[PDB]
Amino acid sequence: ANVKGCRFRVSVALPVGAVVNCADNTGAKNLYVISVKGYHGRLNRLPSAALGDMVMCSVKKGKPELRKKVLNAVIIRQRKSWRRKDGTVIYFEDNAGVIVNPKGEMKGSGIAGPVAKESADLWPKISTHAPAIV
Amino acid sequence: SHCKFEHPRHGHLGFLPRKRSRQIRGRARAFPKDDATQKPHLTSFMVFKAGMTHIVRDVDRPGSKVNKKEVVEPVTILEAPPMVIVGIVGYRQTPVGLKTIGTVWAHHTSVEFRRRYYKNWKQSAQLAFSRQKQFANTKEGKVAEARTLNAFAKKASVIRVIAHTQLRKLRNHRVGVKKAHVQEIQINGGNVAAKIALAKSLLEKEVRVDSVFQQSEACDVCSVTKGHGTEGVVKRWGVACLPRKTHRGLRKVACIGAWHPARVMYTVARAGQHGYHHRTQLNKKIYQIGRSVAVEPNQATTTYDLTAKTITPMGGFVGYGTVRNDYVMLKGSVSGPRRRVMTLRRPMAPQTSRHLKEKIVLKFIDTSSKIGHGRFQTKKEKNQWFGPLKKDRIRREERLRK
Amino acid sequence: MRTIECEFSHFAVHPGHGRRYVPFAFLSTKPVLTFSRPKCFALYMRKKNPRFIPWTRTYRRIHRK
RNA sequence: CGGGGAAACCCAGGUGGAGGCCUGUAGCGAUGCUGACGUGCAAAUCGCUCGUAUGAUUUGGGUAUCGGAGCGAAAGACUCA
RNA sequence: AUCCACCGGCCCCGAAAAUGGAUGACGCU
RNA sequence: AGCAAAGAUCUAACGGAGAUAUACUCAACAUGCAACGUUGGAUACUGGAGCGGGGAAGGAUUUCGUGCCAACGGCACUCGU
RNA sequence: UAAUGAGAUUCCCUCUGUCCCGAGUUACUAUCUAGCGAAACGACAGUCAAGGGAACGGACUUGAAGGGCUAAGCGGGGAA
RNA sequence: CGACGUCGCUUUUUGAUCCUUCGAUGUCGGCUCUUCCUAACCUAGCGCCGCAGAAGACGCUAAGGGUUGGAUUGUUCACCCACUGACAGGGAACGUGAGCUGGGUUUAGACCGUCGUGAGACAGGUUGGUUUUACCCUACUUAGCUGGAAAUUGCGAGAAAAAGAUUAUCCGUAAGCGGACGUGCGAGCGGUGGGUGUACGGUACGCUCACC
RNA sequence: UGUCGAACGGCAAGUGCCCCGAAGCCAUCGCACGGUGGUUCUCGGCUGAACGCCUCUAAGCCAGAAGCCAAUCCCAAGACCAGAUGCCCAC
RNA sequence: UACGUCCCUCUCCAAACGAGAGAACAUGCAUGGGCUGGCAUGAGCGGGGGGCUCGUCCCGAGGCGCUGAACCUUGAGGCCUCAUGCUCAGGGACACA
Ligand SMILES: NC[C@@H]1O[C@H](O[C@H]2[C@@H](O)[C@H](O[C@@H]3[C@@H](O)[C@H](N)C[C@H](N)[C@H]3O[C@H]3O[C@H](CO)[C@@H](O)[C@H](O)[C@H]3N)O[C@@H]2CO)[C@H](N)[C@@H](O)[C@@H]1O
């Protein structure tokens, strides 16, 4: 009940099972999409994520201080091409996420690469620490 | 025993029977509700589909994330030669229905109008509307015209006129039909005495599309879907495809019913005709009522884009040709292939939502090629990327040799 | 809008036509790279120079003029 | 043939071509698809995949052992569907 | 002319299931 | 229902009853289609663990020439074991 | 218990249409024609709702449908 | 909310029975797909609270719509992880094997434990173990052709109709009232004929043949 | 890789393989659209007695659910349409 | 008797087959030209690691030039009348006891 009807429709990229990068410097190196917040159910359909979506994750490779637990990440990059409303189709080289709180605070201090305009606008802690808002 | 999990069922069950359309043309099954406080005006117009393209426009939508920002919207181009009125019918209310009183005719009908009465026009006597033409100006026939015009004023609640597409001004090579498409357009507005005077005045006179619609409104598009033959259950209804190790096949519905009721139901999805269906598709926002190339050599030119260019792309609309007449440009898609006649009808939905009141100004119309990837907007831009090529330097060698 | 030009071939990318792309090693000046074709993005992936391909604008401005 | 050692003997480079050794044709089998076919091409076949392929190996002709009996690396298997 | 305790007749409530449905049907007040 | 593995046939001239087959006032297409053998030519295939050339077992005239087309060669035949 | 296993099981890596979630192309069929030409099956036949009944009717009772004849499908019934 | 009692509904459990089937109704669960029911989990209106708000208890009218992704298990069930507005409960021969799958029960091989002198046994565990046929009738899906109101015939005459319904031109309303070619020769409303420009290219509008 | 002597043009490998590829088809993998009136249930009421006051109910009214019925939407005269019409014939 | 309809012929908005949309001397069809797109610089000819021969002349993958050349572009069916070819009283059957 936080972010769903706030940004436009984006082509979903990362279903449950996906293993994305951690651009956050929380010591982790890896996420694993466990589910997606905002998934109203459809039979046989997986929870899939897009740029602005908060996911439920677990670190599969990183510090054991936060590895075997269910965390909250926010997607910032995806390889799946999404069409913006100004008619431009755009995509990243890699998928990445950044771990957050249940309320959205970034839990680290810096992002590796860029972030999108789609995920920075929903999350002001993500738009602050990002070196380039794509 | 109950189904173990729930999904919503496949396909809307109100578009049954999914059989071929009875006729290829869009036909309104209902016109808008007659407001007798309005001015008498026509309510539908036949246009032909001529490919589609996209535009750029800035958005006036306060509150939105795209407020005063430019979007790219796809639009469909629909060529509209004017239709010529040839008749006036009038309908009277009965407890059975709505019965036709009669029709007056125009005293002068087109060759392509009375071509619609012949399966073979060129190998015929061609003498249709030939005894009605000569009886209409006898003493007794001028009476009988005014006899049934008065019977409209007595009994009719619904006045309609009969138009036809006028295909010889549609100078199109691929729409191969030469007989005209005939429909009835309902007059709405005023009382019945005010409808007939508008039905008499535009009789044997062509009506143009910008006299029926405005530039930034919406409409309904009665049109017949693109046909796809006999398709199976996965293409037609959208059912889930079975696991790979299934014997006798994947693209089937596994259970078509219980033991009891010992019959297959109409709700169970089966195979058969997919496509070539009539659809009405309300709230198609109109963006540009165009004007003929004999009037406008610069059709796609905007205030904000001063490139002198027409609506027809480079290398033409694919499979269609050139838009040679007036045209309407609608937001999005309309049901049907190119070359198919389609009926733009005034809306029955309340046109009061703030998405539908929005006035449209464009900024760019894509006139690039639809063959391949479009790269140049005009041919003037391809002659500046490419300089003089080889075939140009030997045509310039023949022009100096003379 | 505006006509972006392609990164590889410097073609004309009019609105609603190309396909934009942004890599992990992003430039500060060109974070997002606009491409006009998949053929332009394919010769960008195998790391060909825009010159030495005879149909790009880089070639045509150093050899033929 | 070289090297180390007081000796016992060790260490290295080749040579050699051992094995119910290995990959893999033919041959001999028949794992999976629970594939195709299932009024078949076929009263058991087709396809790909698979087991083995110097041995307790495969095979022709000839001979010898049978009906409460024969033969059996044993499945009551086989003894002219 | 107004209250109180009891008892009866018809009617209602109590009275919720999986194909569309049955005083045999229409209907009847 | 079917006659769907083993890529594939095309061409012209001859042969043959198997054609180029028409009641008028019709130039031909729109009123004789399909199919056969042989030689030439084109195109392929098998690919020397061969739709190559010889033998055993088994068959016993299927060999060869000439005629010939009733029935057989699950379509066809002017061809044929 | 090393080596060996068309043996039984579990996890990880790579990997992918197994899946999300389907789409599109090919050869051969189906399909249409020419030639040829079967079988299984077959009491009679063949639209349903309820009632009753050997207590799950195509035939009986009362209702509801049903103009005739076809081509391709299809697997709910014929307790096929 | 409600003991002690008590009156009942339900046939998604199980027991009891033995009516039907042993010249055979394919005997589990998934998967798929459609529909039904209400004893309402979410959604639409509500009443009522030990209802201040926020969350929520109980109830009513309502089954229109929705009711998931997973780990383990062959599982129905169970149990946790997570999303959600919510993850309601059931029926249809314990819906659905010429729809699939074959994990499991439910043969022949083999192993183990307990039993048996043994052959063998085991609502004990384990492993390996052919899923055949539609071209018929109907149903359903689409795709063609074609008669028929005495639903094929009777000639068996019923118009959501006109108003002489008794003779007869129309127009417009009942009281009124507009005009209607005159006698083979004429004329009038008209369909088609020859030459120098008008309305939104070629059709109309200016100035020999039928009918009155 | 083989093969027409080599280049040329090709061809064989049941489409040799690799890259780009029109058109067509197609993806919640893109894009566009998805609307009106009433009836009346629960219920809260209005007038108002039976029952000299009281009372939503007994007559009578009001407002009113995602239900229900229409509009829109899809098929549509075996719904047998003296609905209208064009041209021939026949009366 | 006529109006006509249907087959054969042509087209593809339709299509398993029928049915449908159309056209039937028509830029209708055929080929060409131009456009539009696709690929990426054709055969041919002429001026570089090295290596032969007796400064010169030959062998040499690659490169460069003519050359955004060459080819392909509607066809289950892109565009333009931009040019020319082809049609020469369309044929059969019903309507019709
Ligand atoms: N009878 C002749 C003798 O050969 C001798 O020659 C021998 C030695 O020089 C030398 O002997 C070596 C030596 O390096 C060292 N000190 C000791 C070593 N064991 C010997 O090694 C010898 O024996 C070993 C076996 O162990 C062999 O593998 C090898 O063939 C050989 N090199 O290798 C030669 C043997 O092949 C001497 N010349 C001398 O004693 C005498 O002449």
Ligand SMILES: [Mg+2]
């Ligand atoms: Mg089509």
Ligand SMILES: [Mg+2]
């Ligand atoms: Mg081996």
Ligand SMILES: [Mg+2]
């Ligand atoms: Mg045994």
Ligand SMILES: [Mg+2]
């Ligand atoms: Mg065949």
Ligand SMILES: [Mg+2]
């Ligand atoms: Mg070969």
Ligand SMILES: [Mg+2]
């Ligand atoms: Mg034969």
Ligand SMILES: [Mg+2]
């Ligand atoms: Mg072994």
